[PDB]
Design a protein around this motif. Structure first.
Motif, PDB file in Angstrom:
ATOM      1  N   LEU A 117       0.643  -1.436   0.091  1.00 21.07           N
ATOM      2  CA  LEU A 117       0.512  -0.252  -0.138  1.00 21.07           C
ATOM      3  C   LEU A 117       1.142   1.402  -0.062  1.00 21.07           C
ATOM      4  O   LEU A 117       2.028   0.775   0.646  1.00 21.07           O
ATOM      5  CB  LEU A 117      -0.869   0.070   0.761  1.00 21.07           C
ATOM      6  N   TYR A 118       0.248   2.474  -0.773  1.00 20.59           N
ATOM      7  CA  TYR A 118       0.648   3.763  -0.895  1.00 20.59           C
ATOM      8  C   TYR A 118       1.208   4.390   0.910  1.00 20.59           C
ATOM      9  O   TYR A 118       2.448   4.473   1.351  1.00 20.59           O
ATOM     10  CB  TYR A 118       0.641   4.133  -1.553  1.00 20.59           C
ATOM     11  N   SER A 119      -0.136   4.454   1.261  1.00 22.28           N
ATOM     12  CA  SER A 119       0.535   5.120   2.579  1.00 22.28           C
ATOM     13  C   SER A 119      -0.041   4.836   4.197  1.00 22.28           C
ATOM     14  O   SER A 119      -0.985   4.240   3.314  1.00 22.28           O
ATOM     15  CB  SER A 119      -0.365   6.690   2.508  1.00 22.28           C
ATOM     16  N   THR A 120       0.842   4.649   4.765  1.00 27.02           N
ATOM     17  CA  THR A 120       0.194   3.691   5.710  1.00 27.02           C
ATOM     18  C   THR A 120      -0.574   4.654   7.056  1.00 27.02           C
ATOM     19  O   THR A 120      -0.537   4.029   7.761  1.00 27.02           O
ATOM     20  CB  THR A 120       1.781   3.219   6.437  1.00 27.02           C
ATOM     21  N   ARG A 121      -0.635   5.605   6.382  1.00 28.01           N
ATOM     22  CA  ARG A 121      -1.762   6.666   7.548  1.00 28.01           C
ATOM     23  C   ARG A 121      -2.600   6.981   6.825  1.00 28.01           C
ATOM     24  O   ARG A 121      -2.656   8.222   7.034  1.00 28.01           O
ATOM     25  CB  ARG A 121      -0.768   7.802   7.893  1.00 28.01           C
ATOM     26  N   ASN A 122      -3.483   6.666   5.778  1.00 26.51           N
ATOM     27  CA  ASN A 122      -4.535   7.191   5.635  1.00 26.51           C
ATOM     28  C   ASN A 122      -5.424   5.595   5.674  1.00 26.51           C
ATOM     29  O   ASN A 122      -5.660   4.191   6.173  1.00 26.51           O
ATOM     30  CB  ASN A 122      -4.521   7.263   4.574  1.00 26.51           C
ATOM     31  N   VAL A 123      -6.932   5.862   4.948  1.00 27.05           N
ATOM     32  CA  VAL A 123      -8.172   5.544   5.133  1.00 27.05           C
ATOM     33  C   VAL A 123      -7.494   3.702   4.388  1.00 27.05           C
ATOM     34  O   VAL A 123      -8.072   2.931   5.312  1.00 27.05           O
ATOM     35  CB  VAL A 123      -9.844   6.148   4.681  1.00 27.05           C
ATOM     36  N   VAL A 124      -6.952   4.070   3.916  1.00 26.47           N
ATOM     37  CA  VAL A 124      -6.758   2.853   2.801  1.00 26.47           C
ATOM     38  C   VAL A 124      -6.186   2.015   4.028  1.00 26.47           C
ATOM     39  O   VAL A 124      -6.301   0.702   3.892  1.00 26.47           O
ATOM     40  CB  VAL A 124      -5.927   3.381   1.361  1.00 26.47           C
ATOM     41  N   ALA A 125      -4.950   2.746   4.751  1.00 29.71           N
ATOM     42  CA  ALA A 125      -4.340   1.600   5.604  1.00 29.71           C
ATOM     43  C   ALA A 125      -4.869   1.099   6.293  1.00 29.71           C
ATOM     44  O   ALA A 125      -5.174   0.032   6.654  1.00 29.71           O
ATOM     45  CB  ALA A 125      -2.989   2.542   5.746  1.00 29.71           C
ATOM     46  N   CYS A 126      -5.995   1.732   7.040  1.00 29.26           N
ATOM     47  CA  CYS A 126      -6.591   1.564   8.519  1.00 29.26           C
ATOM     48  C   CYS A 126      -7.917  -0.131   7.802  1.00 29.26           C
ATOM     49  O   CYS A 126      -7.959  -0.795   8.706  1.00 29.26           O
ATOM     50  CB  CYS A 126      -8.266   2.459   8.938  1.00 29.26           C
ATOM     51  N   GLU A 127      -7.858   0.612   6.309  1.00 26.28           N
ATOM     52  CA  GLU A 127      -9.195  -0.878   6.117  1.00 26.28           C
ATOM     53  C   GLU A 127      -8.370  -2.047   5.965  1.00 26.28           C
ATOM     54  O   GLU A 127      -8.584  -2.992   6.236  1.00 26.28           O
ATOM     55  CB  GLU A 127      -9.808  -0.341   4.483  1.00 26.28           C
ATOM     56  N   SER A 128      -7.211  -1.865   5.385  1.00 20.95           N
ATOM     57  CA  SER A 128      -6.670  -3.073   4.724  1.00 20.95           C
ATOM     58  C   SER A 128      -6.255  -3.818   6.161  1.00 20.95           C
ATOM     59  O   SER A 128      -6.153  -4.819   6.426  1.00 20.95           O
ATOM     60  CB  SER A 128      -5.184  -2.622   3.764  1.00 20.95           C
ATOM     61  N   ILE A 129      -5.220  -2.609   6.994  1.00 21.56           N
ATOM     62  CA  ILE A 129      -5.173  -3.443   8.550  1.00 21.56           C
ATOM     63  C   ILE A 129      -6.274  -3.871   9.399  1.00 21.56           C
ATOM     64  O   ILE A 129      -6.185  -5.255   9.653  1.00 21.56           O
ATOM     65  CB  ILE A 129      -4.483  -2.194   9.070  1.00 21.56           C
ATOM     66  N   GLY A 130      -7.404  -3.790   9.454  1.00 17.45           N
ATOM     67  CA  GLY A 130      -9.081  -4.104  10.061  1.00 17.45           C
ATOM     68  C   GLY A 130      -9.310  -5.058   8.473  1.00 17.45           C
ATOM     69  O   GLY A 130      -9.113  -6.689   9.733  1.00 17.45           O
ATOM     70  N   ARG A 131      -8.781  -5.644   7.413  1.00 18.32           N
ATOM     71  CA  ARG A 131      -9.039  -7.018   6.941  1.00 18.32           C
ATOM     72  C   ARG A 131      -7.984  -8.270   7.139  1.00 18.32           C
ATOM     73  O   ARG A 131      -8.343  -8.546   7.434  1.00 18.32           O
ATOM     74  CB  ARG A 131      -9.119  -6.932   5.032  1.00 18.32           C
ATOM     75  N   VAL A 132      -6.814  -7.128   7.526  1.00 20.46           N
ATOM     76  CA  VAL A 132      -5.516  -8.377   7.634  1.00 20.46           C
ATOM     77  C   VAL A 132      -5.927  -9.071   9.274  1.00 20.46           C
ATOM     78  O   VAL A 132      -5.789  -9.926   9.688  1.00 20.46           O
ATOM     79  CB  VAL A 132      -4.428  -7.722   7.522  1.00 20.46           C
ATOM     80  N   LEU A 133      -6.301  -8.028  10.025  1.00 19.93           N
ATOM     81  CA  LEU A 133      -6.778  -8.599  11.463  1.00 19.93           C
ATOM     82  C   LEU A 133      -8.073  -9.459  11.344  1.00 19.93           C
ATOM     83  O   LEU A 133      -8.078  -9.984  12.491  1.00 19.93           O
ATOM     84  CB  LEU A 133      -6.632  -6.942  12.120  1.00 19.93           C
ATOM     85  N   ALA A 134      -8.981  -8.658  10.876  1.00 18.72           N
ATOM     86  CA  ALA A 134      -9.924 -10.251  10.221  1.00 18.72           C
ATOM     87  C   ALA A 134      -9.562 -11.846  10.173  1.00 18.72           C
ATOM     88  O   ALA A 134     -10.303 -11.950  11.261  1.00 18.72           O
ATOM     89  CB  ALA A 134     -11.632  -9.194   9.486  1.00 18.72           C
ATOM     90  N   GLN A 135      -8.968 -11.410   9.597  1.00 18.96           N
ATOM     91  CA  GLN A 135      -8.437 -12.895   8.550  1.00 18.96           C
ATOM     92  C   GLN A 135      -7.808 -13.486   9.882  1.00 18.96           C
ATOM     93  O   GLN A 135      -7.877 -14.906  10.364  1.00 18.96           O
ATOM     94  CB  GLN A 135      -7.616 -12.714   7.867  1.00 18.96           C
ATOM     95  N   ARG A 136      -6.709 -12.562  10.130  1.00 24.37           N
ATOM     96  CA  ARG A 136      -6.162 -13.453  11.717  1.00 24.37           C
ATOM     97  C   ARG A 136      -7.053 -13.937  12.611  1.00 24.37           C
ATOM     98  O   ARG A 136      -6.614 -15.097  13.642  1.00 24.37           O
ATOM     99  CB  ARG A 136      -4.893 -12.647  12.068  1.00 24.37           C
TER     100      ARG A 136
END
Ligand SMILES: [Mg+2]
Ligand SMILES: [Mg+2]
Lengths: 109, 52, 141, 34, 41, 324
Positions: free
Chosen positions: C78-97
């Motif tokens: 991902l491009y920026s680790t401090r934006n809505v995209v980063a938040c959603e990506s980390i949320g999905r990864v956390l959901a899978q884990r």
RNA sequence: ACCUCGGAGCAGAACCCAACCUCCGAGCAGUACAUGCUAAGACUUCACCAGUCAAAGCGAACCUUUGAUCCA
RNA sequence: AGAGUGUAGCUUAAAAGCACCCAACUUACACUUAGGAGAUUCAAUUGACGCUCUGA
């Protein structure tokens, strides 16, 4: 010329000191304002009395105080603190004694 | 001041409960839970019980 | 039959036994303090200046499942680790884990502004669509 | 209404203004401290 | 026409700090604005 | 009287007369962070916790970051909040990079280490994979802490792991029916040649999970050990029972754990099938029984108590008539 | 002039403590109309009367001070 | 000529956390929400590229 002032004392204060065994529902402390704050397994009534939510041992501790954000006056008070300052309060906990149940053999089907 | 009034269920049940409303205020119509019907129903002010 | 020799009382040592049976205690106090401790597992989100991190922590404080954009495996997509995209990506990864860890139920304790935050809304949507439910079942007394 | 290209140009405009005024404040603070 | 007025209150200056402060203010005035270092009352 | 503090009183270091010149908590969240930090810090007073307790790779990473930045399409997607991430690729990369640490956290939380090795820990270096083939088309995986029914775990699972010998073990940390501490093994393959598992030495044949009904949720552990040199080892519960602690004590010299994967199993009808067909015994049924409610010692005169007071202490609800 | 109730000091730190003692306040309002029903366990104004708090459960939903009995 | 030497402003951080900024709410500040940029001086623990100090 001075009338009134004949009200009797409210008999408030701690009802269970530290280490006292407390059953669920027992009132731990009655206070007029929040002298002691509810800790773990300790509830608060309308009148700010602390009662045990579980059966266990009463403990008193000092913990950092972070109020509910909707508590606007407390939040402003915190907003006015310096960076290093952390508010503290006295909290009352009930360390639950018994386990909440055990698995028993009922039938050997 | 305020007056204690008897809100009577509009559901036909004999159920009534007492509320407090300002004397100068209009007669009261209020949704309230009717135990017999087991459902929220309209209650209408019938008569003034007392003045408090 | 010696195979039928069973102790009268069973002793399940699984830490999550009662928690998953929905019978374990929750810390029901702390009414005057934020956040509530009345949970078994909590979703805690830390939005730093550069990185967004999410934790699934037990009541006792043990961190159970963490997803940090700090980790290379995630920041390398991902491009920026401090934006809505980063938040959603980390949320999905956390959901899978969380699903792979068996944590289907969770409590999220945001401040009013955190809840109003669109990034937090996206993170919650990611978690719920990934399967984790951000509302723990009531204790059975 | 608006289109996608103008929105992208606006975002890049904000980015480049951020960089420009960041250099501006950095040089101002450098003069300050010096 | 009308002229909009604004006030800024300041307290606490050091010797060199005051110099830097007002020279920066002097050099950072965009276009046709009026400064002042007047006192209270 | 006043006893002096037994240590640095909080809010003492910053206690200064320059309050106006001191920066303040402009925000609630920063105060929250500081408060959490102080709570984590140890203290000399009674506290709640007392009672309720290479460089080339880095260069490559920087270059990749710069490339992603250079890709303008990525910036457009990011600022339109439409970009996403490859979940499978992220999973694989995390497994390779730092998955073992998270799996160690999960094992510690689930208490495997304290119940299998008495607190002695390790790290699951090998990204082990287990999956119980459900039907023929699919196979339910067994992650660290998964949830798999004994029906799906009826047959032995397919195991895959990129490595090169190995000894694989399955234990039920909490399925024991007689002794609280012991545990039952379901299948043990030893002297695995590389990756292929069909060639493993089957010391103890495979058993499916058998968590008794209403006995909660049992945790089943797949252990995988690197093996330096083979060693000869050695449907009855008496011989399926043992302690992984002393078992791995007897083999720690040439065996070392390198993989883990565990799952939660509940009751299922396959459990009845297991208890009857092959274990050949009556299945035990367990019920979660809470302690009886506490009542104060009954008084002769329950002053001010409601009429229900007598019911609190009567045992039979049916009318009784004494001598009559 | 006072007679009931309550807040502060006397009475500094569990509770409790008088007075023609030093001061202050109240005889309700606003709100809603689950501000419902039930119920473990407790507090209690030094008695009793009276007065408080309350888990769990059911049911809707998603509150902050004055007075007995009889008699009507 | 010699000494101290060296992570973006700071870090008994190991490529992170604080700092920093614009946009909106603010008169304004602040808060919050959105975004932004950033470094371990070059070669093999060591030598040499840059900064501070001691002299001419
Ligand atoms: Mg008094
Ligand atoms: Mg009494």
């Amino acid at each position: 010329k001075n009338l009134g002032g004949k009200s009797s004392g409210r008999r408030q204060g701690i009802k269970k000191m530290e280490g006292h065994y407390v059953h669920a529902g027992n009132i731990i402390a009655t206070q007029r304002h929040f002298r002691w704050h509810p800790g773990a397994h300790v509830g608060v009534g309308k009148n700010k009395c602390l009662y045990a939510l579980e059966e266990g041992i009463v403990r008193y501790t000092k913990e950092v105080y972070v109020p509910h954000p909707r508590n606007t006056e407390a939040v402003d008070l915190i907003t006015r603190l310096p960076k290093g300052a952390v508010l503290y309060k006295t909290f009352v906990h009930v360390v639950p004694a018994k386990p909440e149940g055990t698995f028993k053999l009922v039938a050997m089907l | 001041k305020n007056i204690l009034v008897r809100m009577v269920s509009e559901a036909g049940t004999g159920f009534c409960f007492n509320t407090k409303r300002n004397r100068l205020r209009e007669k009261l119509t209020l949704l309230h839970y009717d135990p017999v019907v087991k459902q929220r129903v309209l209650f209408v002010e019938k008569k003034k019980i007392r003045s408090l | 039959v010696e195979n039928e020799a069973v102790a009268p009382e069973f002793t399940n040592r699984n830490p999550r036994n009662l928690e998953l049976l929905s019978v374990a205690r929750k810390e029901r106090g702390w009414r005057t303090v934020f956040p509530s401790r009345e949970f078994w597992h909590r979703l805690r989100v830390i939005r730093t200046q550069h990185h967004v991190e999410a934790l699934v922590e037990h009541q006792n404080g043990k961190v159970v499942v963490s997803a940090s954009t700090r980790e290379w495996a995630i920041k390398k997509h991902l491009y920026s680790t401090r934006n809505v995209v980063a938040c959603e990506s980390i949320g999905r990864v956390l959901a899978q884990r969380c699903l792979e860890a068996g944590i289907n139920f969770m409590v999220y304790q945001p401040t009013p502004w955190e809840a109003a935050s669109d990034s937090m809304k996206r993170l919650q949507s990611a978690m719920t669509e990934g399967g984790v439910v951000l509302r723990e079942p009531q204790r059975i007394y | 209404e608006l289109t996608f290209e103008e929105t992208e140009r606006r975002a890049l405009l904000l980015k480049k203004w951020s960089l420009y005024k960041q250099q501006e404040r950095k040089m101002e603070r450098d003069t300050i401290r010096a | 026409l009308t002229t909009h007025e604004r006030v800024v209150q300041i307290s606490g200056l050091s010797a060199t700090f005051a110099e830097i402060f007002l020279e920066i203010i002097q050099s950072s005035l965009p276009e046709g604005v009026r400064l002042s270092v007047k006192e209270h009352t | 009287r006043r006893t002096p503090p037994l240590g640095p009183m909080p809010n003492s270091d910053i206690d200064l007369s320059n309050l106006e010149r001191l920066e303040k908590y402009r925000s609630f969240d920063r105060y929250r962070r500081r408060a959490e930090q102080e709570a984590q810090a140890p203290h000399w007073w009674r506290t709640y916790r007392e009672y309720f307790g290479r460089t080339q790779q880095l260069l490559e990473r920087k270059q990749a970051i710069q490339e992603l930045r250079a890709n303008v399409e990525e910036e457009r997607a990011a600022r339109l909040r439409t970009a996403s991430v490859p979940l499978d690729a992220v999973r694989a990369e995390w497994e390779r990079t730092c998955g073992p640490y998270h799996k160690q956290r999960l094992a510690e939380y689930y208490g495997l280490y304290r119940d299998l090795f008495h607190g002695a820990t390790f790290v699951p270096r090998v990204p082990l994979h287990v999956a119980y083939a459900v039907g023929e088309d699919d196979l339910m995986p067994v992650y660290c802490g998964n949830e798999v029914t004994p029906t799906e775990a009826a047959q032995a699972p397919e195991v895959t792991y990129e490595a090169e010998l190995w000894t694989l073990l399955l234990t039920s940390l909490d399925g024991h029916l007689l002794e609280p501490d012991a545990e039952y093994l379901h299948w043990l393959l030893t002297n695995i040649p590389g990756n292929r598992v069909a060639e493993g030495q089957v010391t103890c044949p495979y058993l499916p999970p058998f968590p008794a009904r209403g006995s909660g949720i049992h945790r089943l552990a797949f252990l995988l050990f690197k093996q330096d040199q083979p060693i000869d080892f050695s449907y009855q519960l008496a011989q399926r029972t043992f302690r992984t602690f002393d078992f791995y004590k007897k083999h720690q010299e040439t065996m070392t754990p390198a993989g883990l994967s565990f799952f939660q199993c509940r009751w299922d009808d396959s459990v009845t099938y297991i208890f009857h067909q092959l274990l050949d015994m009556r299945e035990p049924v367990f019920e979660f029984v809470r302690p009886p409610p506490y009542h104060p010692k009954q008084k002769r005169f329950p002053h001010r108590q409601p009429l229900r007071y007598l019911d609190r202490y009567r045992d039979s609800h049916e009318p009784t008539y004494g001598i009559y």
